[PDB]
Amino acid sequence: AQPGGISDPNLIKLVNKLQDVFTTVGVNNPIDLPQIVVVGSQSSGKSSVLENIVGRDFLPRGQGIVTRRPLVLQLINRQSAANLDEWGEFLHLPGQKFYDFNKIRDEINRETEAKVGRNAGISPAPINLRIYSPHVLNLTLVDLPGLTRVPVGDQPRDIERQIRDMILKYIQKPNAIILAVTAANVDLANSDGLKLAREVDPEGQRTIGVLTKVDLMDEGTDVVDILAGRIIPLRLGYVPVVNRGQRDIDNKKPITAALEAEKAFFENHKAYRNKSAYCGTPYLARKLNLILMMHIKQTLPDIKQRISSSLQKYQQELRRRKECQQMVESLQRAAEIVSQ
Amino acid sequence: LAQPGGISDPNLIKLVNKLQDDLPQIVVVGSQSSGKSSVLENIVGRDFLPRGQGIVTRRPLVLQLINRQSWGEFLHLPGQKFYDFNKIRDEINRETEAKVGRNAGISPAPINLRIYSPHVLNLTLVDLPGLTRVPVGDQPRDIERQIRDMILKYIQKPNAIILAVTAANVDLANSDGLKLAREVDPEGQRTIGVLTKVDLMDEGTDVVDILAGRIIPLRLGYVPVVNRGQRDIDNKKPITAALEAEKAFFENHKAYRNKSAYCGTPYLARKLNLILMMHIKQTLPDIKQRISSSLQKYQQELEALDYTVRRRKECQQMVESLQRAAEIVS
Numbered sequence A: 001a002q003p004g005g006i007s008d009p010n011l012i013k014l015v016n017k018l019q020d021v022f023t024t025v026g027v028n029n030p031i032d033l034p035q036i037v038v039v040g041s042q043s044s045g046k047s048s049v050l051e052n053i054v055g056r057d058f059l060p061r062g063q064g065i066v067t068r069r070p071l072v073l074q075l076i077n078r079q080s081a082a083n084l085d086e087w088g089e090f091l092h093l094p095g096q097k098f099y100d101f102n103k104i105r106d107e108i109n110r111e112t113e114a115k116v117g118r119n120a121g122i123s124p125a126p127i128n129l130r131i132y133s134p135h136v137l138n139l140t141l142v143d144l145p146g147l148t149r150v151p152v153g154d155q156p157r158d159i160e161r162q163i164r165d166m167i168l169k170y171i172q173k174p175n176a177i178i179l180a181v182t183a184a185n186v187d188l189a190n191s192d193g194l195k196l197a198r199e200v201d202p203e204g205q206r207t208i209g210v211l212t213k214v215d216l217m218d219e220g221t222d223v224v225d226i227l228a229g230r231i232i233p234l235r236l237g238y239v240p241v242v243n244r245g246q247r248d249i250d251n252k253k254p255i256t257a258a259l260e261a262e263k264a265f266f267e268n269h270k271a272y273r274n275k276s277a278y279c280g281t282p283y284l285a286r287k288l289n290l291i292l293m294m295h296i297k298q299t300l301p302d303i304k305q306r307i308s309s310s311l312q313k314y315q316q317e318l319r320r321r322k323e324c325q326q327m328v329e330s331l332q333r334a335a336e337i338v339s340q
Numbered sequence B: 001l002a003q004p005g006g007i008s009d010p011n012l013i014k015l016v017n018k019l020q021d022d023l024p025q026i027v028v029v030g031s032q033s034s035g036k037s038s039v040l041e042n043i044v045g046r047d048f049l050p051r052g053q054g055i056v057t058r059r060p061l062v063l064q065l066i067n068r069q070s071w072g073e074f075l076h077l078p079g080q081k082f083y084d085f086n087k088i089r090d091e092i093n094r095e096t097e098a099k100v101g102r103n104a105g106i107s108p109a110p111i112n113l114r115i116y117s118p119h120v121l122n123l124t125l126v127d128l129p130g131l132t133r134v135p136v137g138d139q140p141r142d143i144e145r146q147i148r149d150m151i152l153k154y155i156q157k158p159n160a161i162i163l164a165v166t167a168a169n170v171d172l173a174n175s176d177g178l179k180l181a182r183e184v185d186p187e188g189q190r191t192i193g194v195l196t197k198v199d200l201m202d203e204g205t206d207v208v209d210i211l212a213g214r215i216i217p218l219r220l221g222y223v224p225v226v227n228r229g230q231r232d233i234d235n236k237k238p239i240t241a242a243l244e245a246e247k248a249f250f251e252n253h254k255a256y257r258n259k260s261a262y263c264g265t266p267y268l269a270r271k272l273n274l275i276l277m278m279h280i281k282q283t284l285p286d287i288k289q290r291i292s293s294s295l296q297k298y299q300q301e302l303e304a305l306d307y308t309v310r311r312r313k314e315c316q317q318m319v320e321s322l323q324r325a326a327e328i329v330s
């Protein structure tokens, strides 16, 4: 559970408090948090980014096509590094609990291979995963295969159309935050992630550009012009990232060492020092945290109005008396908490 | 620029000159900033193409090599000769900017350049902008379609060798060059894959599987190359040092030593030279047939024989000339 992001203890406490408040005054819950979806070209580093957001390794990563089926991860808050209060469970394996996240990765691989073989095949049938933990939100993440241009192995001629439709079904909804993942060692104008995001989200009200592989850029080049909004501007801006390379994947490098390595990388290069606070996985997590806090606080006006109307009605109305006065006190406490 | 073992091989030029006494054009296709201009200029052997990150090439450049025995000429600047190739590069930049501004605009209107040298062939090369996905600057929403059509106009012809340029630091299945080449040349009988930026690949990864033909096979195969990075461009590094650097890179990397002879710009030049020689030797059947028929006709006439005198002379001269030509062929 990493502080200052989407698993922020403060944010989880806030959501739980507000949920209990609403469930103590007969008011339906309006908190409809968006799902976070990664979209981009093949091997652009989407699974790496998503697992970095989660904070524990559990997604299959590697060169070529690795993710070949949508993985719909369902974070589940559960009142109480193989922990016991935390685990994952698959829908196609009901009843089974996965406390070892390495076993979750292994099961994702096995389930994928069992349905799309081991020859680059693809399927839109999602792998549904629930992760229970007392330190997460009721949030939905989505990992997707990367878009390609030339088919390989069992792939049909229209593989691009299939992958594109598979992604569009997940990013077409207005309540979805699009992580458009682009490799930094590629010109930004070639980004499939930005292309698709702009296709669904032209106004950029829910698209975050994530520039991966910045440690693999040609010597003397940087992404500073993009961050400043000088090439292809994004309302929500860009975030550079340094995930684990292929050598690190083969060596099963832990996530913590990789995050420290990213921190050092951005603290040492002359082009990113002056803006190091705006670099790395932590800043992407902070952007997502701010967006979620925005979505929560945007529901405070109508809730205040509803509570005011209910209080006016109940006060005009006044075992029934005791319950009603308790409800009046509860409504006032609810208004107070909605204020803080 | 008179480099042996490529498209400017002196023996090949001598052969062409012998034969006279319709080569295909070479077109580069690939994603933006994939290194197409670098590959093309290395094939030619002299620096004269604008290079750099972002969008640099924004208009087709139709370079026409012309053999001449004792410089550059632009269509929009008639009469001016460019002996200094740096000025050729500057003029390409200026002419591009004169029609598409300086904000990434693009146009299919080509810049026509002729380079005369006694060490070149009568050949046509074409440099093109790279395909993109998102518009930039003044570019319209359909910039991708416009660039795609601009390229198709040049690679749809059957007499075109397609250098499909793919950066090696990108998965091959994302290659725009291969997609387009297969779109026009599905049988791959005239497509050569060129893998650039091999010096920027993630540690532990290589293109050994691609060269071996295990991912996306190409009849004519793949060639890895190491062009000048942006740091080299800024320092105006000469071509000789850059090519030596490519040679050393492939002579030292653990994955390519055992096959260094099949890597680099020299090997791509050798491939193109063999393709051109094939196209030349493909013109030998009809020439032999025509010479044989002409010889039969003239020999019949001579056997038959003031007009008779100056016709017998003509026929004997034509017989000698046809025999000399038929021997040149052999």
Ligand SMILES: Nc1nc2c(ncn2[C@@H]2O[C@H](COP(=O)(O)OP(=O)(O)O)[C@@H](O)[C@H]2O)c(=O)[nH]1
Pocket: A041, A042, A043, A044, A045, A046, A047, A048, A049, A060, A061, A062, A063, A064, A065, A066, A067, A146, A212, A213, A214, A215, A216, A241, A242, A243, A244, A245, A246, A247, A249, B202
């Ligand atoms: N060096 C480096 N390699 C990266 C980075 N991000 C991704 N990669 C590599 O990119 C390849 C594909 O990564 P992955 O996360 O599986 O991409 P996906 O196919 O889009 O899910 C792997 O070899 C990763 O090591 C990065 O920031 N730096």
Ligand SMILES: Nc1nc2c(ncn2[C@@H]2O[C@H](COP(=O)(O)OP(=O)(O)O)[C@@H](O)[C@H]2O)c(=O)[nH]1
Pocket: A218, B031, B032, B033, B034, B035, B036, B037, B038, B039, B050, B051, B052, B053, B054, B055, B056, B057, B130, B196, B197, B198, B199, B200, B225, B226, B227, B228, B229, B230, B231, B233
């Ligand atoms: N290090 C390195 N950089 C390369 C290589 N090939 C291309 N580049 C860089 O890629 C960028 C764009 O190159 P360019 O030839 O102009 O590509 P074009 O837009 O397709 O014509 C420049 O910064 C080049 O230095 C290569 O093999 N190695």
Ligand code: ALF
Pocket: A041, A042, A043, A044, A045, A046, A047, A062, A063, A064, A065, A066, A067, A068, A144, A145, A146, A147
């Ligand atoms: F393995 Al991928 F996009 F190439 F998840």
Ligand code: ALF
Pocket: B031, B032, B033, B034, B036, B037, B052, B053, B054, B055, B056, B057, B058, B128, B129, B130, B131
């Ligand atoms: F400058 Al380019 F393809 F990006 F020639």
Ligand SMILES: [Mg+2]
Pocket: A046, A047, A048, A060, A061, A066, A067, A143, A144, A145
């Ligand atoms: Mg993946």
Ligand SMILES: [Mg+2]
Pocket: B036, B037, B038, B050, B051, B056, B057, B127, B128, B129
């Ligand atoms: Mg170019």
Ligand code: NA
Pocket: A042, A043, A044, A062, A063, A064, A065, A066, A067
């Ligand atoms: Na991949």
Ligand code: NA
Pocket: B032, B033, B034, B052, B053, B054, B055, B056, B057
């Ligand atoms: Na470029």
